[PDB]
Protein backbone atom coordinates (compact mmCIF):
# COMPACT_ATOMS: atom_id res chain seq x y z
CA UNK A 1 0.00 0.00 0.00
CA UNK A 2 0.97 3.65 -0.39
CA UNK A 3 0.22 4.51 3.25
CA UNK A 4 3.17 2.33 4.33
CA UNK A 5 5.67 4.06 2.01
CA UNK A 6 6.52 6.77 4.55
CA UNK A 7 7.29 4.03 7.08
CA UNK A 8 9.82 2.37 4.76
CA UNK A 9 11.83 5.59 4.53
CA UNK A 10 11.65 5.87 8.32
CA UNK A 11 13.38 2.51 8.70
CA UNK A 12 15.84 3.73 6.06
CA UNK A 13 16.84 7.01 7.70
CA UNK A 14 17.27 4.84 10.82
CA UNK A 15 20.94 4.29 10.01
CA UNK A 16 23.21 1.25 10.45
Amino acid at each position, epitope marked *: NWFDITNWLWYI*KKKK
Partner: antibody, heavy 124, light 109 residues
Framework: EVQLVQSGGEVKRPGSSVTVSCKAT????????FNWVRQAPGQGPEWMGG????????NYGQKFQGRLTIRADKSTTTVFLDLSGLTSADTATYYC?????????????????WGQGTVITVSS | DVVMTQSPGTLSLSPGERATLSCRAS???????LAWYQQKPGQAPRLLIY???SRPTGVPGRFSGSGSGTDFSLTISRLEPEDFAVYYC?????????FGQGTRLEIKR
Protein backbone atom coordinates in the same frame (compact mmCIF):
# COMPACT_ATOMS: atom_id res chain seq x y z
CA GLU B 1 2.52 22.36 17.16
CA VAL B 2 2.09 21.01 13.63
CA GLN B 3 -0.28 23.38 11.84
CA LEU B 4 -1.89 23.25 8.40
CA VAL B 5 -3.44 26.48 7.08
CA GLN B 6 -5.54 26.26 3.92
CA SER B 7 -6.55 28.86 1.36
CA GLY B 8 -9.92 30.55 1.47
CA GLY B 9 -13.20 29.21 0.20
CA GLU B 10 -14.32 29.91 -3.33
CA VAL B 11 -17.18 29.56 -5.82
CA LYS B 12 -16.24 27.86 -9.09
CA ARG B 13 -18.15 27.80 -12.37
CA PRO B 14 -19.28 24.33 -13.52
CA GLY B 15 -16.69 22.72 -15.77
CA SER B 16 -13.78 24.81 -14.46
CA SER B 17 -10.91 23.71 -12.19
CA VAL B 18 -10.11 24.64 -8.59
CA THR B 19 -6.77 24.68 -6.78
CA VAL B 20 -6.61 24.44 -2.98
CA SER B 21 -3.38 24.98 -1.07
CA CYS B 22 -2.28 23.81 2.37
CA LYS B 23 0.65 25.53 4.11
CA ALA B 24 2.32 23.11 6.53
CA THR B 25 4.50 24.26 9.43
CA UNK B 26 5.20 22.84 12.85
CA UNK B 27 7.64 20.04 12.08
CA UNK B 28 8.74 17.34 9.64
CA UNK B 29 7.08 17.75 6.24
CA UNK B 30 9.03 15.98 3.51
CA UNK B 31 9.00 12.36 4.77
CA UNK B 32 5.34 12.00 5.82
CA UNK B 33 2.14 11.52 3.86
CA PHE B 34 -0.28 14.39 3.32
CA ASN B 35 -3.79 13.38 2.26
CA TRP B 36 -6.78 15.26 0.86
CA VAL B 37 -10.21 14.47 2.29
CA ARG B 38 -13.47 16.16 1.28
CA GLN B 39 -16.90 16.23 2.92
CA ALA B 40 -20.06 17.22 1.10
CA PRO B 41 -22.86 18.99 3.03
CA GLY B 42 -24.72 16.43 5.12
CA GLN B 43 -22.28 13.64 4.25
CA GLY B 44 -19.20 11.90 5.56
CA PRO B 45 -15.54 12.46 4.72
CA GLU B 46 -14.22 11.00 1.48
CA TRP B 47 -10.52 10.36 0.95
CA MET B 48 -9.32 11.72 -2.39
CA GLY B 49 -5.57 11.14 -2.56
CA GLY B 50 -2.22 11.69 -0.94
CA UNK B 51 1.37 12.78 -1.48
CA UNK B 52 4.73 11.97 0.07
CA UNK B 53 6.67 15.14 -0.79
CA UNK B 54 10.15 13.56 -0.58
CA UNK B 55 9.95 12.01 -4.06
CA UNK B 56 6.46 13.30 -4.96
CA UNK B 57 4.94 9.83 -4.68
CA UNK B 58 1.20 10.19 -5.23
CA ASN B 59 -1.78 7.93 -4.66
CA TYR B 60 -5.13 8.83 -6.24
CA GLY B 61 -8.54 7.39 -5.47
CA GLN B 62 -10.02 5.54 -8.44
CA LYS B 63 -13.12 7.75 -8.56
CA PHE B 64 -11.02 10.93 -8.99
CA GLN B 65 -8.45 9.70 -11.51
CA GLY B 66 -8.37 11.91 -14.58
CA ARG B 67 -9.77 14.87 -12.63
CA LEU B 68 -7.51 15.05 -9.56
CA THR B 69 -3.94 16.30 -9.29
CA ILE B 70 -1.96 16.46 -6.05
CA ARG B 71 1.33 18.36 -5.82
CA ALA B 72 3.77 19.29 -3.09
CA ASP B 73 6.32 22.08 -2.68
CA LYS B 74 9.22 21.22 -0.37
CA SER B 75 10.69 24.73 -0.65
CA THR B 76 7.58 26.12 1.11
CA THR B 77 6.18 22.94 2.78
CA THR B 78 2.93 23.45 0.87
CA VAL B 79 0.73 20.73 -0.65
CA PHE B 80 -1.70 21.45 -3.48
CA LEU B 81 -5.03 19.99 -4.57
CA ASP B 82 -6.23 20.43 -8.16
CA LEU B 83 -9.67 19.24 -9.26
CA SER B 84 -10.77 19.69 -12.87
CA GLY B 85 -14.07 19.12 -14.63
CA LEU B 86 -16.05 20.48 -11.70
CA THR B 87 -19.71 19.57 -11.21
CA SER B 88 -22.18 20.10 -8.39
CA ALA B 89 -21.09 16.73 -6.97
CA ASP B 90 -17.76 18.36 -6.01
CA THR B 91 -19.34 20.99 -3.75
CA ALA B 92 -17.76 20.19 -0.39
CA THR B 93 -15.39 21.29 2.33
CA TYR B 94 -11.87 20.13 1.44
CA TYR B 95 -9.45 19.14 4.20
CA CYS B 96 -5.69 18.67 4.11
CA UNK B 97 -4.71 16.03 6.65
CA UNK B 98 -1.26 14.79 7.69
CA UNK B 99 -0.51 11.36 9.07
CA UNK B 100 0.66 11.25 12.65
CA UNK B 101 4.09 10.94 14.20
CA UNK B 102 4.53 8.77 17.24
CA UNK B 103 7.65 8.42 19.31
CA UNK B 104 11.16 8.79 17.84
CA UNK B 105 9.43 9.17 14.47
CA UNK B 106 7.35 6.42 12.81
CA UNK B 107 4.51 7.18 10.39
CA UNK B 108 1.17 6.42 12.00
CA UNK B 109 -0.74 6.44 8.66
CA UNK B 110 -3.88 7.66 10.43
CA UNK B 111 -4.74 11.31 9.81
CA UNK B 112 -3.78 13.08 13.03
CA UNK B 113 -3.43 16.74 11.97
CA TRP B 114 -6.07 18.55 9.92
CA GLY B 115 -6.33 21.90 8.19
CA GLN B 116 -9.22 24.23 8.91
CA GLY B 117 -10.94 23.24 5.67
CA THR B 118 -11.63 25.01 2.38
CA VAL B 119 -15.26 25.42 1.34
CA ILE B 120 -15.67 24.92 -2.40
CA THR B 121 -19.08 25.55 -3.93
CA VAL B 122 -19.53 24.56 -7.56
CA SER B 123 -22.45 26.58 -8.89
CA SER B 124 -23.33 29.48 -11.18
CA ASP C 1 -13.29 -2.27 -3.34
CA VAL C 2 -13.60 -2.53 0.46
CA VAL C 3 -16.81 -0.85 1.71
CA MET C 4 -17.02 0.34 5.33
CA THR C 5 -20.47 0.13 6.99
CA GLN C 6 -21.06 1.56 10.47
CA SER C 7 -23.75 0.56 12.99
CA PRO C 8 -26.12 1.74 14.27
CA GLY C 9 -26.84 4.71 11.99
CA THR C 10 -27.86 6.72 15.06
CA LEU C 11 -26.89 5.74 18.60
CA SER C 12 -28.86 7.47 21.37
CA LEU C 13 -27.41 7.03 24.85
CA SER C 14 -27.31 8.80 28.21
CA PRO C 15 -24.47 10.93 29.60
CA GLY C 16 -22.28 8.76 31.79
CA GLU C 17 -23.47 5.57 30.07
CA ARG C 18 -21.32 3.04 28.20
CA ALA C 19 -21.12 3.28 24.40
CA THR C 20 -20.07 0.79 21.71
CA LEU C 21 -20.01 1.74 18.01
CA SER C 22 -19.49 -0.96 15.37
CA CYS C 23 -17.72 -0.70 12.00
CA ARG C 24 -17.73 -3.54 9.46
CA ALA C 25 -15.59 -3.96 6.34
CA SER C 26 -16.80 -5.68 3.19
CA UNK C 27 -13.50 -7.59 3.25
CA UNK C 28 -10.82 -8.17 5.86
CA UNK C 29 -8.57 -5.19 6.60
CA UNK C 30 -4.92 -6.26 6.51
CA UNK C 31 -2.81 -5.61 9.61
CA UNK C 32 -5.62 -3.89 11.52
CA UNK C 33 -5.09 -0.60 9.67
CA LEU C 34 -8.31 0.92 11.03
CA ALA C 35 -8.78 4.32 12.64
CA TRP C 36 -11.63 6.03 14.47
CA TYR C 37 -12.33 9.75 14.33
CA GLN C 38 -14.65 12.09 16.21
CA GLN C 39 -16.31 15.05 14.51
CA LYS C 40 -18.33 17.80 16.13
CA PRO C 41 -20.40 20.27 14.07
CA GLY C 42 -18.24 22.65 12.02
CA GLN C 43 -14.86 21.14 12.94
CA ALA C 44 -12.53 18.81 11.10
CA PRO C 45 -12.52 15.22 12.36
CA ARG C 46 -10.19 14.39 15.24
CA LEU C 47 -8.31 11.09 15.35
CA LEU C 48 -9.29 9.00 18.38
CA ILE C 49 -7.84 5.57 17.54
CA TYR C 50 -5.33 4.27 15.00
CA UNK C 51 -3.99 0.81 14.13
CA UNK C 52 -7.12 -0.83 15.63
CA UNK C 53 -6.26 -0.27 19.28
CA SER C 54 -3.52 2.38 19.57
CA ARG C 55 -4.55 5.73 21.02
CA PRO C 56 -2.73 8.94 19.99
CA THR C 57 -1.44 11.32 22.62
CA GLY C 58 -4.08 13.72 23.93
CA VAL C 59 -7.07 11.37 23.55
CA PRO C 60 -8.60 10.50 26.96
CA GLY C 61 -8.24 6.92 28.17
CA ARG C 62 -12.01 6.39 28.25
CA PHE C 63 -11.74 5.80 24.47
CA SER C 64 -10.70 2.37 23.23
CA GLY C 65 -10.82 0.49 19.95
CA SER C 66 -10.92 -3.21 19.18
CA GLY C 67 -11.60 -5.53 16.27
CA SER C 68 -9.15 -8.10 14.83
CA GLY C 69 -10.67 -8.20 11.37
CA THR C 70 -13.87 -6.65 10.02
CA ASP C 71 -15.68 -5.66 13.23
CA PHE C 72 -14.19 -2.69 15.03
CA SER C 73 -15.88 -1.45 18.18
CA LEU C 74 -15.04 1.97 19.47
CA THR C 75 -15.96 1.93 23.15
CA ILE C 76 -16.45 4.90 25.45
CA SER C 77 -16.60 3.64 29.01
CA ARG C 78 -18.29 6.76 30.41
CA LEU C 79 -19.93 9.12 27.91
CA GLU C 80 -18.98 12.66 28.92
CA PRO C 81 -21.10 15.56 27.61
CA GLU C 82 -18.40 16.50 25.06
CA ASP C 83 -18.43 12.98 23.57
CA PHE C 84 -21.77 13.34 21.75
CA ALA C 85 -20.75 13.77 18.12
CA VAL C 86 -20.53 11.90 14.82
CA TYR C 87 -17.94 9.13 14.65
CA TYR C 88 -16.25 7.78 11.52
CA CYS C 89 -14.16 4.67 10.90
CA UNK C 90 -11.52 4.49 8.18
CA UNK C 91 -9.56 1.59 6.72
CA UNK C 92 -6.08 2.26 5.35
CA UNK C 93 -4.59 -1.24 5.03
CA UNK C 94 -4.81 -1.08 1.23
CA UNK C 95 -3.54 1.61 -1.13
CA UNK C 96 -7.11 2.98 -1.50
CA UNK C 97 -8.35 4.17 1.90
CA UNK C 98 -12.05 4.68 2.64
CA PHE C 99 -14.28 6.01 5.42
CA GLY C 100 -17.47 4.58 6.85
CA GLN C 101 -20.76 6.43 6.58
CA GLY C 102 -20.70 7.57 10.22
CA THR C 103 -22.52 6.77 13.45
CA ARG C 104 -24.27 9.69 15.17
CA LEU C 105 -23.92 9.43 18.96
CA GLU C 106 -26.52 11.76 20.47
CA ILE C 107 -28.07 12.38 23.88
CA LYS C 108 -30.99 10.24 25.04
CA ARG C 109 -33.94 11.91 26.74
Amino acid sequence: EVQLVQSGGEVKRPGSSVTVSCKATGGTFSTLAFNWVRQAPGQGPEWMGGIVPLFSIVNYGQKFQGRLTIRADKSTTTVFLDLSGLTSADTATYYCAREGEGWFGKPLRAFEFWGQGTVITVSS
Amino acid sequence: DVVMTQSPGTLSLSPGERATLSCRASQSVSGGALAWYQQKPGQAPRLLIYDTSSRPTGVPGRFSGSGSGTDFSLTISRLEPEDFAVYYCQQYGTSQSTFGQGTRLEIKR
